[PDB]
Amino acid sequence: FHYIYSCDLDINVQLKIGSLEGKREQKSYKAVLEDPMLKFSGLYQETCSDLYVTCQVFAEGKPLALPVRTSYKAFSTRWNWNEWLKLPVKYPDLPRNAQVALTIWDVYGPGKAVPVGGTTVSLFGKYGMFRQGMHDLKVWPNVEADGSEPTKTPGRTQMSRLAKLTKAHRQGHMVKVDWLDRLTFREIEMINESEKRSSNFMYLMVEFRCVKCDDKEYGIVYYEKDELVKVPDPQMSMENLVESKHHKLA
Amino acid sequence: VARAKHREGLVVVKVFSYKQELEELKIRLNSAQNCLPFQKMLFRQYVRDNLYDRISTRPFLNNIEKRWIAFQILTAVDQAHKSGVRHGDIKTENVMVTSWNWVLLTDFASFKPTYLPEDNPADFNYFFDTSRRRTCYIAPERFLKRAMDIFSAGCVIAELFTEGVPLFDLSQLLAYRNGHFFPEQVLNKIEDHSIRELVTQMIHREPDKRLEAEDYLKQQRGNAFPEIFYTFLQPYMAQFAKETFLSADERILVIRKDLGNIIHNLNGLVILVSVITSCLQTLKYCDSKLAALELILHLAPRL
Numbered sequence: 240f241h242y243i244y245s246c247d248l249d250i251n252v253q254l255k256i257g258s259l260e261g262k263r264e265q266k267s268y269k270a271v272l273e274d275p276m277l278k279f280s281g282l283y284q285e286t287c288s289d290l291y292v293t294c295q296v297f298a299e300g301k302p303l304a305l306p307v308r309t310s311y312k313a314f315s316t317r318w319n320w321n322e323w324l325k326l327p328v329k330y331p332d333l334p335r336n337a338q339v340a341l342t343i344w345d346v347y348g349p350g351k352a353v354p355v356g357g358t359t360v361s362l363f364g365k366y367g368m369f370r371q372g373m374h375d376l377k378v379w380p381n382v383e384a385d386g387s388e389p390t391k392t393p394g395r396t397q398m399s400r401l402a403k404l405t406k407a408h409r410q411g412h413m414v415k416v417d418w419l420d421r422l423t424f425r426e427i428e429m430i431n432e433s434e435k436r437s438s439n440f441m442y443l444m445v446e447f448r449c450v451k452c453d454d455k456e457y458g459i460v461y462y463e464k465d466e467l468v469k470v471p472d473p474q475m476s477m478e479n480l481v482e483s484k485h486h487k488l489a
Numbered sequence: 490v491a492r493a494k495h496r497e498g499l500v501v502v503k504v505f506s507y508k509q510e511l512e513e514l515k516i517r518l519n520s521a522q523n524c525l526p527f528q529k530m531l532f533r534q535y536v537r538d539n540l541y542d543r544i545s546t547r548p549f550l551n552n553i554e555k556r557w558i559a560f561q562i563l564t565a566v567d568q569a570h571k572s573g574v575r576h577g578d579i580k581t582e583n584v585m586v587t588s589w590n591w592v593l594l595t596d597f598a599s600f601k602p603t604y605l606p607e608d609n610p611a612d613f614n615y616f617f618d619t620s621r622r623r624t625c626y627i628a629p630e631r632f633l634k635r636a637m638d639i640f641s642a643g644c645v646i647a648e649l650f651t652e653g654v655p656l657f658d659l660s661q662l663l664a665y666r667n668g669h670f671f672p673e674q675v676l677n678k679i680e681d682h683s684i685r686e687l688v689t690q691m692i693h694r695e696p697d698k699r700l701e702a703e704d705y706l707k708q709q710r711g712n713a714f715p716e717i718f719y720t721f722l723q724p725y726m727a728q729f730a731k732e733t734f735l736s737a738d739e740r741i742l743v744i745r746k747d748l749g750n751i752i753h754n755l756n757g758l759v760i761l762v763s764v765i766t767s768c769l770q771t772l773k774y775c776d777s778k779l780a781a782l783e784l785i786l787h788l789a790p791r792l
């Protein structure tokens with residue numbers, strides 16, 4: 240088990256926006272009847288809309304930097320961004336409970352945008368490790384990605400059983416057999432496909448920097464570098480800052 | 490006298506049976522949180538400030554803080570006498586004010602005599618005259634008892650509220666004892682009429698009139714010393730008078746946790762800030778610094 244601390248790793252955190260896989264619900268006729276602007280909305284167009292996914296890092300319910308958009312990319316039959324966003328924040332400046340909000344947007348009319356979803360996935364998961372691989376976050380509908388702690392739009396909650404076991408397989412903790420796992424893995428793929436299909440919500444896929452300039456084998460871990468006398472005195476010998484303030488002023 | 494250093498602290502050492510008496514003060518005044526006798530050539534802890542220096546520093550004791558210090562002086566007077574201890578020689582140079590306004594009464598004079606021959610000032614000059622400011626607060630009857638001290642405490646309070654001006658020098662005190670002198674100018678210098686009456690009552694020429702420090706506290710409960718001192722600050726501030734929160738991190742965390750109750754009662758906030766900052770200038774872990782900053786932001790609108 241090899242790892243590099245978050246404090247030492249001084250680069251920009253990068254995130255890949257994959258494909259928003261799901262089905263998008265529409266309104267009734269009366270809604271467009273009362274508000275004709277819905278006809279020209281993005282959702283009411285026959286082809287997939289040109290959505291763009293903003294991203295902002297939060298911490299303790301406080302925004303940590305400006306959001307980052309996705310470069311314009313046309314869509315014909317699917318939402319496949321496959322873009323490597325660069326985040327303003329760096330690894331040593333991410334607090335423990337940092338969480339990345341990701342909001343989808345769509346046109347509503349001249350000079351207006353309307354959120355078409357929202358997801359919030361923690362960066363430092365259990366055991367204080369930076370989440371890696373290809374995680375498929377959930378999509379809460381018609382709500383901007385909420386950054387408050389605890390989040391009101393969480394990303395990730397027998398599918399759970401197989402999620403844990405697959406991890407233990409590739410971390411070396413499992414019995415060794417070739418054909419059996421070669422078939423079982425396709426089985427899990429089909430099971431996950433069915434589970435995703437059944438779920439009514441959308442699901443936005445996302446990937447972290449599993450492969451970087453350094454060996455992929457390493458992982459990131461949260462880290463930081465911080466009877467003569469009985470009655471305590473915690474400032475016995477320091478500078479009198481008020482004295483200095485008065486001396487400097489006049 | 491000279492300062493020294495210690496493995497994990499600082500010390501003050503003086504060079505000149507009695508040893509047994511000093512340890513008696515160590516036990517008795519271990520319960521008395523606002524006292525500090527000879528911990529051991531005599532050795533003890535070096536405190537941040539003295540009363541005189543603290544008066545003459547850029548942070549300037551307000552009326553509220555001076556009243557609190559008078560309250561704690563009286564509290565130390567009680568705690569001393571209850572256990573069976575009498576200071577004997579109280580003065581501004583022996584009331585050490587820690588960085589968080591925790592008055593400590595130190596240098597319990599058990600070696601000084603009791604009676605001074607009024608025709609020979611040699612004893613005063615050799616024993617009591619150390620600062621050489623010529624201020625004398627020895628009890629007129631002496632020329633021990635709680636009476637002999639309450640007088641000294643009242644004189645110290647009057648001096649404290651007069652910004653270092655003394656109530657008596659040796660000549661003024663001797664004239665006062667004779668019955669042909671009364672410092673109406675110093676008593677008129679006192680900031681508040683309430684503590685002026687307090688000094689006047691504490692300094693009755695004839696000892697029998699002087700009350701106990703407990704009664705003087707009791708009368709002042711209404712206006713002289715606000716009730717908040719008796720109920721809230723006396724117990725709550727006593728937590729930091731021991732080794733439970735030696736680390737500034739723990740102090741800041743505890744104060745943050747209890748901020749809900751503290752704001753409920755407390756104003757005494759001046760003492761709270763004098764507590765927090767001493768923790769500020771030494772914090773080590775980042776969480777402690779952020780908590781201290783949050784505390785500072787919380788207290789700011791109230792100040």
Ligand SMILES: Nc1nc2c(ncn2[C@@H]2O[C@H](COP(=O)(O)OP(=O)(O)OP(=O)(O)O)[C@@H](O)[C@H]2O)c(=O)[nH]1
Nearest residue numbers: 501535536537538539542578582583585596619620
């Ligand atoms: N600021 C500060 N000064 C101290 C401290 N301890 C001792 N001193 C100094 O030591 C001097 C002691 O003077 P006094 O208070 O009259 O005591 P003394 O001179 O030993 O004579 P006694 O009345 O018998 O105690 C004071 O003037 C202080 O300046 C301390 O902890 N802090």
